Paper text:
Similar to the pattern observed for HAZV and GANV, QYBV vOTU shows the most activity towards K11, though at lower overall levels. Additionally, QYBV vOTU shows a more pronounced difference in the relative preference for K48 versus K63 linkages, with substantially more activity towards K48. In QYBV vOTU, Trp72 packs with Pro85. Additionally, it is in proximity to His79, suggesting potential stacking of the rings. Specifically, direct interactions, or the lack thereof, work in conjunction with the other interactions to complete the structural features. This is most notable in QYBV vOTU, in which Phe14 appears to pack with Pro76. In contrast, the DGKV and QYBV vOTUs possess more polar residues, including asparagine, glutamate, and threonine for DGKV and glutamine and lysine in QYBV. Despite being phylogenetically distant from CCHFV and the other robust vOTU DUBs, QYBV demonstrates substantial Ub activity and possesses Ile130 that could pack with Ub’s Leu8. Further, increasing the hydrophobicity of the pocket in QYBV vOTU was able to enhance Ub-AMC cleavage, boosting activity by 150% and 50% for the Q19V and Q128A mutants, respectively.
Author numbering: 6 to 156
The structure:
Amino acid sequence: NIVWEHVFDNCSQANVVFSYREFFNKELTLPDGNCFFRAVSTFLYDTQNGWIEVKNMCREFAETNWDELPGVHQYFQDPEHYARESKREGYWGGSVEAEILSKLLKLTVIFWKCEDDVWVTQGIRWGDGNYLTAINLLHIQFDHFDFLVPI
């Protein structure tokens, strides 16, 4: 059992050390700048090939539900600013889209930080759920995300 500490809006955080293979199997995503969206696409569609649809749905939720996205507001002026920056191909996904997707899909999203391919040393969570029901991502160096499936 894990103690989540509230950070901001629907975002919380946990310092915790564990072997991620103790609780997860990993699925690698293609190492390009779309890796975040490929990991979410795997969760949603059981293939990484739908990363473009994940980018689209984030943009669309930003335009219809801008009022609900204070973490996105920290970095982008309005939905059009978000849409322009995310439509470029060297756009890297991350905590902005984890907030969007947690609220669009009514799901919990968790980044598990791992720097040696063995030990997780930190979790960051959007939503109130536990990891069994969450989109779990392995966040490693160079802003790469792989997908984690709970055992």
